[PDB]
From TrEMBL, chains B, D:
This is Toxin. The lineage of its organism: Bacteria, Pseudomonadati, Pseudomonadota, Gammaproteobacteria, Alteromonadales. Belongs to the RelE toxin family. It comes from Pseudoalteromonas rubra. Keywords: Plasmid, Toxin-antitoxin system. It comes from the Bacteria. PANTHER family: TOXIN PARE1, TOXIN PARE1-RELATED. InterPro entries: ParE1/4, RelE/ParE_toxin, RelE/ParE_toxin_dom_sf, TA_system_RelE-like_toxin.
TrEMBL record, chain C:
CDD domains: RHH_NikR_HicB-like. Antitoxin component of a type II toxin-antitoxin (TA) system. Neutralizes the effect of toxin ParE. PANTHER family: ANTITOXIN PARD (PTHR36582:SF2). The keyword Chloroplast does not apply. Keywords: Plasmid, Toxin-antitoxin system. Belongs to the ParD antitoxin family. This is Antitoxin ParD. GO terms for biological process: regulation of DNA-templated transcription. The keyword ATP-binding does not apply. Transmembrane segments: none annotated.
Length: 80, 95, 92, 95
Protein backbone atom coordinates (compact mmCIF):
# COMPACT_ATOMS: atom_id res chain seq x y z
CA UNK A 1 0.00 0.00 0.00
CA UNK A 2 1.81 3.06 -1.29
CA UNK A 3 0.75 6.68 -1.48
CA UNK A 4 1.43 9.31 -4.13
CA UNK A 5 2.27 12.68 -2.58
CA UNK A 6 3.08 16.20 -3.77
CA UNK A 7 5.87 17.57 -1.60
CA UNK A 8 6.23 20.84 -3.49
CA UNK A 9 9.45 21.77 -5.25
CA UNK A 10 11.45 22.88 -2.19
CA UNK A 11 10.95 19.65 -0.23
CA UNK A 12 11.10 17.50 -3.38
CA UNK A 13 14.61 18.74 -4.08
CA UNK A 14 15.50 18.21 -0.42
CA UNK A 15 14.44 14.57 -0.77
CA UNK A 16 16.26 14.10 -4.08
CA UNK A 17 19.52 15.41 -2.65
CA UNK A 18 19.44 12.98 0.27
CA UNK A 19 18.81 10.03 -2.04
CA UNK A 20 21.45 10.99 -4.61
CA UNK A 21 24.07 11.52 -1.90
CA UNK A 22 23.57 7.88 -0.86
CA UNK A 23 22.55 8.86 2.68
CA UNK A 24 19.12 7.28 2.06
CA UNK A 25 18.32 4.43 -0.32
CA UNK A 26 14.99 5.71 -1.67
CA UNK A 27 12.50 8.54 -1.57
CA UNK A 28 10.48 6.28 0.75
CA UNK A 29 13.27 6.06 3.36
CA UNK A 30 13.47 9.88 3.53
CA UNK A 31 9.72 10.18 3.81
CA UNK A 32 9.60 7.56 6.59
CA UNK A 33 12.29 9.40 8.55
CA UNK A 34 10.23 12.58 8.36
CA UNK A 35 7.07 10.76 9.43
CA UNK A 36 8.89 9.20 12.39
CA UNK A 37 9.85 12.69 13.53
CA UNK A 38 6.27 13.87 13.19
CA UNK A 39 5.00 10.84 15.11
CA UNK A 40 7.60 11.35 17.88
CA UNK A 41 6.64 15.03 18.28
CA UNK A 42 3.14 14.05 19.35
CA UNK A 43 3.77 10.59 20.84
CA UNK A 44 3.84 11.95 24.40
CA UNK A 45 0.55 13.86 24.33
CA UNK A 46 -1.87 11.40 22.73
CA UNK A 47 -4.35 11.81 25.59
CA UNK A 48 -4.47 15.60 25.22
CA UNK A 49 -4.80 15.24 21.45
CA UNK A 50 -7.70 12.79 21.80
CA UNK A 51 -9.38 15.01 24.39
CA UNK A 52 -9.11 17.88 21.93
CA UNK A 53 -10.67 15.84 19.11
CA UNK A 54 -13.51 14.74 21.41
CA UNK A 55 -14.08 18.30 22.64
CA UNK A 56 -14.19 19.57 19.05
CA UNK A 57 -16.83 16.92 18.34
CA UNK A 58 -18.79 17.95 21.44
CA UNK A 59 -18.62 21.62 20.48
CA UNK A 60 -19.51 21.05 16.79
CA UNK A 61 -23.26 21.60 17.26
CA UNK A 62 -26.39 19.74 18.21
CA UNK A 63 -26.40 16.08 17.28
CA UNK A 64 -28.84 15.12 14.53
CA UNK A 65 -30.41 11.74 13.71
CA UNK A 66 -28.22 9.46 11.63
CA UNK A 67 -29.59 9.10 8.10
CA UNK A 68 -27.49 6.60 6.15
CA UNK A 69 -29.50 7.00 2.94
CA UNK A 70 -29.00 10.77 2.94
CA UNK A 71 -25.28 10.35 3.65
CA UNK A 72 -24.70 7.95 0.75
CA UNK A 73 -26.82 10.10 -1.57
CA UNK A 74 -24.65 13.07 -0.62
CA UNK A 75 -21.56 10.96 -1.24
CA UNK A 76 -22.62 10.08 -4.76
CA UNK A 77 -23.72 13.64 -5.49
CA UNK A 78 -20.09 14.70 -4.91
CA UNK A 79 -18.54 14.15 -8.34
CA UNK A 80 -21.04 11.42 -9.43
CA UNK B 1 -36.41 1.65 18.03
CA UNK B 2 -33.29 2.93 19.78
CA UNK B 3 -32.19 6.45 18.89
CA UNK B 4 -28.99 7.22 17.02
CA UNK B 5 -27.75 10.78 16.57
CA UNK B 6 -24.40 12.15 15.39
CA UNK B 7 -22.56 15.35 16.21
CA UNK B 8 -21.89 17.36 13.03
CA UNK B 9 -18.15 16.69 13.33
CA UNK B 10 -18.76 12.92 13.56
CA UNK B 11 -20.73 13.08 10.35
CA UNK B 12 -17.79 14.99 8.86
CA UNK B 13 -15.47 12.24 10.12
CA UNK B 14 -17.59 9.73 8.22
CA UNK B 15 -17.32 11.82 5.08
CA UNK B 16 -13.52 11.96 5.39
CA UNK B 17 -13.39 8.22 6.10
CA UNK B 18 -15.58 7.55 3.09
CA UNK B 19 -13.48 9.73 0.80
CA UNK B 20 -10.22 8.19 2.03
CA UNK B 21 -11.52 4.69 1.36
CA UNK B 22 -13.05 5.75 -1.95
CA UNK B 23 -9.82 7.31 -3.25
CA UNK B 24 -7.81 4.12 -2.58
CA UNK B 25 -10.40 1.31 -3.02
CA UNK B 26 -13.40 2.67 -4.95
CA UNK B 27 -17.10 3.08 -4.31
CA UNK B 28 -18.00 -0.48 -3.31
CA UNK B 29 -15.41 -0.70 -0.54
CA UNK B 30 -16.19 2.78 0.80
CA UNK B 31 -19.91 2.03 0.91
CA UNK B 32 -19.24 -1.33 2.57
CA UNK B 33 -17.12 0.35 5.22
CA UNK B 34 -19.84 2.89 6.01
CA UNK B 35 -22.29 -0.03 6.11
CA UNK B 36 -20.11 -1.76 8.73
CA UNK B 37 -19.99 1.50 10.69
CA UNK B 38 -23.77 1.85 10.38
CA UNK B 39 -24.35 -1.74 11.54
CA UNK B 40 -22.15 -1.13 14.59
CA UNK B 41 -24.00 2.11 15.39
CA UNK B 42 -27.25 0.15 15.52
CA UNK B 43 -25.74 -2.59 17.67
CA UNK B 44 -24.38 0.02 20.12
CA UNK B 45 -27.76 1.78 20.29
CA UNK B 46 -29.39 -1.51 21.33
CA UNK B 47 -26.89 -2.93 23.86
CA UNK B 48 -25.45 -0.78 26.65
CA UNK B 49 -23.09 -3.55 27.74
CA UNK B 50 -20.99 -3.38 24.56
CA UNK B 51 -19.74 0.15 25.29
CA UNK B 52 -16.16 0.43 26.52
CA UNK B 53 -15.85 2.87 29.41
CA UNK B 54 -13.63 5.79 28.36
CA UNK B 55 -14.05 7.91 31.51
CA UNK B 56 -10.27 8.31 31.53
CA UNK B 57 -10.61 10.51 28.43
CA UNK B 58 -13.88 12.27 29.39
CA UNK B 59 -16.45 11.21 32.03
CA UNK B 60 -19.21 9.22 30.39
CA UNK B 61 -17.40 8.85 27.08
CA UNK B 62 -17.67 5.40 25.48
CA UNK B 63 -15.67 3.74 22.72
CA UNK B 64 -16.16 0.78 20.42
CA UNK B 65 -14.00 -0.54 17.57
CA UNK B 66 -15.12 -1.15 14.02
CA UNK B 67 -12.52 -2.01 11.40
CA UNK B 68 -9.55 0.31 11.80
CA UNK B 69 -11.68 3.01 13.46
CA UNK B 70 -13.19 3.76 16.86
CA UNK B 71 -16.68 5.12 17.49
CA UNK B 72 -16.57 7.56 20.41
CA UNK B 73 -20.04 8.14 21.79
CA UNK B 74 -22.22 8.80 24.81
CA UNK B 75 -25.20 6.88 26.10
CA UNK B 76 -28.55 8.67 26.04
CA UNK B 77 -31.89 7.74 27.58
CA UNK B 78 -33.04 6.12 24.32
CA UNK B 79 -29.86 5.20 22.45
CA UNK B 80 -26.46 6.75 21.70
CA UNK B 81 -24.97 10.04 20.53
CA UNK B 82 -21.84 9.64 18.37
CA UNK B 83 -19.23 12.32 19.09
CA UNK B 84 -16.34 11.39 16.78
CA UNK B 85 -15.30 8.50 14.57
CA UNK B 86 -11.52 8.37 14.62
CA UNK B 87 -8.80 6.14 13.23
CA UNK B 88 -7.49 3.71 15.83
CA UNK B 89 -4.08 5.43 15.62
CA UNK B 90 -5.69 8.30 17.60
CA UNK B 91 -6.66 6.02 20.51
CA UNK B 92 -5.54 6.37 24.13
CA UNK B 93 -6.48 3.18 26.02
CA UNK B 94 -6.78 3.21 29.80
CA UNK B 95 -3.42 3.12 31.62
CA UNK C 1 -2.25 25.74 -18.32
CA UNK C 2 -1.76 27.80 -21.49
CA UNK C 3 -2.10 25.92 -24.77
CA UNK C 4 1.23 24.57 -25.99
CA UNK C 5 2.53 24.22 -22.41
CA UNK C 6 2.39 21.27 -20.00
CA UNK C 7 1.78 20.59 -16.32
CA UNK C 8 4.99 20.50 -14.27
CA UNK C 9 3.55 19.17 -11.01
CA UNK C 10 5.94 16.53 -9.67
CA UNK C 11 4.69 13.83 -7.31
CA UNK C 12 6.45 10.89 -5.74
CA UNK C 13 5.02 7.48 -4.90
CA UNK C 14 6.31 6.23 -1.57
CA UNK C 15 5.94 3.18 0.65
CA UNK C 16 5.60 4.36 4.24
CA UNK C 17 5.13 0.88 5.72
CA UNK C 18 1.92 -0.10 7.51
CA UNK C 19 2.62 1.62 10.84
CA UNK C 20 3.33 5.07 9.40
CA UNK C 21 0.65 4.65 6.71
CA UNK C 22 -2.01 4.23 9.39
CA UNK C 23 -0.53 7.21 11.23
CA UNK C 24 -0.94 9.38 8.12
CA UNK C 25 -4.45 8.07 7.46
CA UNK C 26 -5.67 8.95 10.95
CA UNK C 27 -4.32 12.51 10.74
CA UNK C 28 -6.12 13.05 7.42
CA UNK C 29 -9.40 11.48 8.54
CA UNK C 30 -9.43 13.50 11.78
CA UNK C 31 -9.39 16.70 9.72
CA UNK C 32 -6.07 17.76 11.32
CA UNK C 33 -4.49 17.67 7.83
CA UNK C 34 -6.24 18.02 4.50
CA UNK C 35 -4.30 15.40 2.49
CA UNK C 36 -1.63 12.71 2.75
CA UNK C 37 0.74 15.21 1.08
CA UNK C 38 0.31 17.80 3.89
CA UNK C 39 1.23 15.19 6.54
CA UNK C 40 4.27 14.09 4.56
CA UNK C 41 5.37 17.73 4.06
CA UNK C 42 5.17 18.41 7.84
CA UNK C 43 7.38 15.37 8.39
CA UNK C 44 9.86 16.51 5.77
CA UNK C 45 9.99 20.00 7.28
CA UNK C 46 10.91 18.46 10.64
CA UNK C 47 13.64 16.38 9.01
CA UNK C 48 14.98 19.48 7.17
CA UNK C 49 14.95 21.47 10.48
CA UNK C 50 16.84 18.74 12.37
CA UNK C 51 19.79 18.99 9.94
CA UNK C 52 19.55 22.65 9.05
CA UNK C 53 22.21 23.69 11.57
CA UNK C 54 24.85 21.17 10.52
CA UNK C 55 25.04 21.66 6.75
CA UNK C 56 28.74 22.54 6.88
CA UNK C 57 29.60 19.43 8.91
CA UNK C 58 27.35 17.34 6.67
CA UNK C 59 29.05 18.56 3.51
CA UNK C 60 32.53 18.09 4.98
CA UNK C 61 31.56 14.50 5.77
CA UNK C 62 30.33 13.88 2.21
CA UNK C 63 33.56 15.39 0.84
CA UNK C 64 35.76 13.33 3.19
CA UNK C 65 33.84 10.17 2.29
CA UNK C 66 34.56 10.93 -1.35
CA UNK C 67 38.24 11.50 -0.55
CA UNK C 68 38.46 8.18 1.33
CA UNK C 69 36.58 6.18 -1.31
CA UNK C 70 39.71 5.10 -3.21
CA UNK C 71 42.15 6.44 -5.75
CA UNK C 72 40.65 8.52 -8.53
CA UNK C 73 40.41 6.90 -11.98
CA UNK C 74 39.72 8.18 -15.50
CA UNK C 75 36.19 9.15 -16.51
CA UNK C 76 34.57 8.07 -19.79
CA UNK C 77 31.03 9.17 -20.59
CA UNK C 78 30.28 6.49 -23.21
CA UNK C 79 31.50 3.66 -20.98
CA UNK C 80 29.40 4.96 -18.07
CA UNK C 81 26.31 5.11 -20.28
CA UNK C 82 27.06 1.66 -21.68
CA UNK C 83 27.21 0.37 -18.12
CA UNK C 84 23.88 2.03 -17.35
CA UNK C 85 22.37 0.22 -20.36
CA UNK C 86 23.68 -3.12 -19.15
CA UNK C 87 21.88 -2.92 -15.80
CA UNK C 88 18.56 -3.69 -17.49
CA UNK C 89 16.23 -2.57 -20.26
CA UNK C 90 16.02 1.21 -20.73
CA UNK C 91 13.23 3.21 -22.34
CA UNK C 92 12.09 6.72 -23.13
CA UNK D 1 44.73 17.08 -23.05
CA UNK D 2 44.02 18.12 -19.48
CA UNK D 3 43.43 15.28 -17.08
CA UNK D 4 40.04 14.35 -15.66
CA UNK D 5 39.79 11.72 -12.94
CA UNK D 6 36.93 10.83 -10.58
CA UNK D 7 36.91 9.41 -7.08
CA UNK D 8 34.95 6.13 -6.91
CA UNK D 9 32.31 7.79 -4.74
CA UNK D 10 31.84 10.54 -7.35
CA UNK D 11 31.23 7.83 -9.95
CA UNK D 12 28.66 6.29 -7.60
CA UNK D 13 27.07 9.73 -7.23
CA UNK D 14 26.69 9.91 -11.00
CA UNK D 15 25.06 6.47 -11.05
CA UNK D 16 22.54 7.56 -8.40
CA UNK D 17 21.93 10.84 -10.24
CA UNK D 18 21.38 8.96 -13.48
CA UNK D 19 18.98 6.48 -11.89
CA UNK D 20 17.00 9.22 -10.16
CA UNK D 21 16.68 11.11 -13.44
CA UNK D 22 15.84 7.91 -15.33
CA UNK D 23 13.01 6.94 -12.97
CA UNK D 24 11.48 10.41 -13.36
CA UNK D 25 12.14 11.18 -17.01
CA UNK D 26 13.33 8.14 -18.99
CA UNK D 27 16.49 7.27 -20.86
CA UNK D 28 16.86 10.21 -23.25
CA UNK D 29 16.72 12.85 -20.52
CA UNK D 30 18.84 10.93 -18.01
CA UNK D 31 21.64 10.25 -20.47
CA UNK D 32 21.52 13.88 -21.61
CA UNK D 33 21.92 15.02 -18.01
CA UNK D 34 25.05 12.86 -17.58
CA UNK D 35 26.30 14.17 -20.92
CA UNK D 36 25.87 17.76 -19.68
CA UNK D 37 27.79 16.86 -16.51
CA UNK D 38 30.53 15.37 -18.70
CA UNK D 39 30.76 18.57 -20.82
CA UNK D 40 31.09 20.59 -17.60
CA UNK D 41 33.79 18.15 -16.39
CA UNK D 42 35.76 18.75 -19.59
CA UNK D 43 35.43 22.53 -19.37
CA UNK D 44 36.58 22.58 -15.74
CA UNK D 45 39.59 20.43 -16.62
CA UNK D 46 40.66 23.03 -19.20
CA UNK D 47 39.88 26.34 -17.41
CA UNK D 48 41.29 26.94 -13.94
CA UNK D 49 39.52 30.32 -13.58
CA UNK D 50 36.01 28.78 -13.60
CA UNK D 51 36.55 26.97 -10.28
CA UNK D 52 34.75 28.43 -7.24
CA UNK D 53 37.00 28.51 -4.18
CA UNK D 54 35.53 26.27 -1.45
CA UNK D 55 38.36 26.53 1.10
CA UNK D 56 35.70 27.30 3.72
CA UNK D 57 34.57 23.66 3.42
CA UNK D 58 38.01 22.03 2.91
CA UNK D 59 41.35 23.63 1.94
CA UNK D 60 41.80 23.40 -1.80
CA UNK D 61 38.22 22.29 -2.48
CA UNK D 62 36.58 23.73 -5.60
CA UNK D 63 32.95 23.82 -6.70
CA UNK D 64 31.02 24.49 -9.88
CA UNK D 65 27.30 24.23 -10.72
CA UNK D 66 25.69 22.16 -13.45
CA UNK D 67 21.93 21.77 -13.61
CA UNK D 68 20.63 21.10 -10.10
CA UNK D 69 23.98 19.67 -9.00
CA UNK D 70 27.40 20.83 -7.88
CA UNK D 71 30.70 19.31 -8.94
CA UNK D 72 33.13 19.28 -6.02
CA UNK D 73 36.70 18.82 -7.13
CA UNK D 74 40.38 19.42 -6.55
CA UNK D 75 42.85 20.96 -8.97
CA UNK D 76 45.75 18.70 -9.91
CA UNK D 77 48.97 19.32 -11.82
CA UNK D 78 47.40 18.37 -15.16
CA UNK D 79 43.68 18.96 -14.62
CA UNK D 80 41.07 18.19 -11.95
CA UNK D 81 40.03 15.36 -9.65
CA UNK D 82 36.29 15.15 -8.98
CA UNK D 83 35.54 14.22 -5.36
CA UNK D 84 31.72 14.27 -5.21
CA UNK D 85 28.80 15.33 -7.38
CA UNK D 86 26.06 16.47 -5.02
CA UNK D 87 22.61 17.96 -5.34
CA UNK D 88 22.61 21.71 -4.76
CA UNK D 89 20.43 21.18 -1.69
CA UNK D 90 23.59 19.83 0.02
CA UNK D 91 25.51 23.06 -0.63
CA UNK D 92 27.11 25.22 2.05
CA UNK D 93 27.99 28.43 0.19
CA UNK D 94 30.58 30.89 1.39
CA UNK D 95 29.34 33.42 3.92
Amino acid sequence: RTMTVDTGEELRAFVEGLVESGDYKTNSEVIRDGLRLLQEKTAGSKLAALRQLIDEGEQSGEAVPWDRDSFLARMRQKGP
Amino acid sequence: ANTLVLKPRAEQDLERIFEYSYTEFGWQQAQQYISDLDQTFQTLAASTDLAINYDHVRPGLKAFPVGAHIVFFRATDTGIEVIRVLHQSMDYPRH
